[PDB]
Amino acid sequence: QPEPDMITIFIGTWNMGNAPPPKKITSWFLSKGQGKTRDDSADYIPHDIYVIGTQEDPLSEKEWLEILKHSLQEITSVTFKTVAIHTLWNIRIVVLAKPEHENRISHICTDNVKTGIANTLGNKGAVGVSFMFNGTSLGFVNSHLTSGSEKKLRRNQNYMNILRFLALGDKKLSPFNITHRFTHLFWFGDLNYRVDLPTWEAETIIQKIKQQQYADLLSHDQLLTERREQKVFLHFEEEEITFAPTYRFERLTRDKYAYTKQKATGMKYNLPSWCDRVLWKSYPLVHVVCQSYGSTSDIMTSDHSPVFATFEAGVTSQFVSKNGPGTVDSQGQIEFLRCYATLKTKSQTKFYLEFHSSCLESFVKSQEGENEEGSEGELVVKFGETLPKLKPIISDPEYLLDQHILISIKSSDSDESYGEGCIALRLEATETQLPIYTPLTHHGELTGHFQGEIKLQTSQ
């Protein structure tokens, strides 16, 4: 039975509106409704992994597990294994996997972050799950961010708090937040970003939706505009939206957007919006293709419609050689040449690098680089040809070219990271000096750049 090189992952996000679901929700797991939908011919084909994110979920974990498992079994005739379930307040994440994956899945982590302070702490935040699938790390975040058209700044702050404080993945990757810890990261939920148009335009917006004309609406989507100005979700992908806004509906139909201010809304308008979203971020040159992204038309218990997205995702085997794991493979080495970091920092400390990778027995600290003044004010840290030679555990190119090196640049004075990034070893050539490049981030904001040349030696 061969180990896979590809899996399909289903991501669902639904704000249930504190209402139990209808008896049939199979349309969700089949990616049927509006947008980029799944072909009929695939309906009996199970996804390898189903990650279900809910918000305003009124069910017990047991009640929702019963509905989810029975739903998938009806569709696929497969009895899915529960990998993880985590619930913060009414925010919930469920990971289900095909039974043949049970002994491929290990190192399962769960965590939550509560966002806000005093007034604003009590119901918003994120739940998450991470695990290894053979040699591939996977993380999943379900976030319910701050509501309200006039709170996109709050939403961006909620995002930065979740990505700083959600403790998933390999704790040995201590310089690195969840946006660097996984081969594939999926971040979904009721992100709560709104179509920023005047309240007087509501009926015009509704008109535009009935005509399936979304272009002039998406140009005002706060998530799309905030991402374009690099305020939020830096270096995440989102598939093109081709489905009507998923909020706010009158319940028990989809024929009406309920946007007018009411006591129940705190006297706030809820203009039709894409509150309900799936974004991802994969390590450089790993296969990840979105195969669906849409909303259901036929689940109407909530003022939100469910959103599905499906993904082909590249996975690797748990590699064993004669040598590593348990030693180095002297036939392998990773060399950095002519490397410099550019940092936006005003500080004057010395910097050193840390190289972290599952292809190394443990992380490698460099010597300090040489600080220069850049033309336009910047700090440029020069490493030149000083950087330590990295000793992979396995030299087999079938392993090593599928790996990645995480880079942190750290203050000698404080040992704090000023920047994190990632280099793919999926090079055009081995035993050849080749350009490498990663942006550097800290708390998921741009702090600089790292570039140079790599020279990779493999057993071939």
Ligand X SMILES: NC(=O)C1CCN(C(=O)Nc2ccccc2)CC1
Question: Between 97 and 205, whose beta carbon lies closer to ligand X?
Answer: 97
Task: Give the separation between CA 150 and CA 196, rounded to whole angstroms.
Answer: 9
Cβ closest to ligand X, residue 50 vs residue 233: 50
Rounded CA separation 179/161 (Å): 12
CB of 84 to ligand X, least distance (A): 6
- Total of chain residues touching ligand X, rule CB under 6 A: 9
Which residue minimizes CB distance to ligand X? Answer: 105
CA distances from 255 to 103, 206, 210, 213 (A): 46, 10, 9, 16
Residue owning tokens 């036929």: 298
Give the largest CA-CA distance in the chain: 70
Q: Nearest CA to 290 among 306, 272, 271, 309?
A: 309
The window from 37-45, 75-83, 244-252, 261-269 that contacts ligand X (CB under 6 A) reads 75-83
Neighbours of 102 (CB within 10 A): 10
Give the nearest distance from C-beta 96 to ligand X in angstroms. 9
- Cβ proximity to ligand X: between 133 and 418 the closer is 133
**Which residues lie across from 14 on neighbouring strands?**
54
Quick check: helix, strand or coil at residue 204?
A: helix
The residue among 39 and 100 lying less far from ligand X, judged by its C-beta, is 100
Q: Is 335 exposed, middle or buried (0-12, 13-18, 19+ CB in 10 A)?
A: middle
432: contact with ligand X by CB under 6 A: no
Q: CB of residue 69 vs ligand X: minimum separation in angstroms?
A: 12
* Residue with smaller CB distance to ligand X, 105 or 223: 105
Nearer to ligand X, 81 or 455 (CB): 81
Report in angstroms how near the CB of residue 25 gets to ligand X at its nearest.
22
Q: One symbol per residue from 79 to 118: x for binding ligand X (CB under 6 A), - otherwise; what is it?
A: --xxxxx-----------x----x--x--x----------
Closer by beta carbon to ligand X, 65 or else 337: 65
N residues, the chain? 460
Extract the tokens encoding 116: 């806000």
Minimum CB separation from ligand X for residue 100, in Å?
A: 11
| Residue linked to tokens 């989810």 | 68
Smallest gap from Cβ 105 to ligand X, in A, equals: 4
Please, what is the minimum distance in Å from the beta carbon of residue 82 to ligand X? 5
CA-CA-CA-CA torsion sign (269, 271, 277, 283): negative
- Terminal Cα distance for the chain, rounded: 27
Query: Which positions touch ligand X (CB under 6 A)?
Result: 81-85, 97, 102, 105, 108
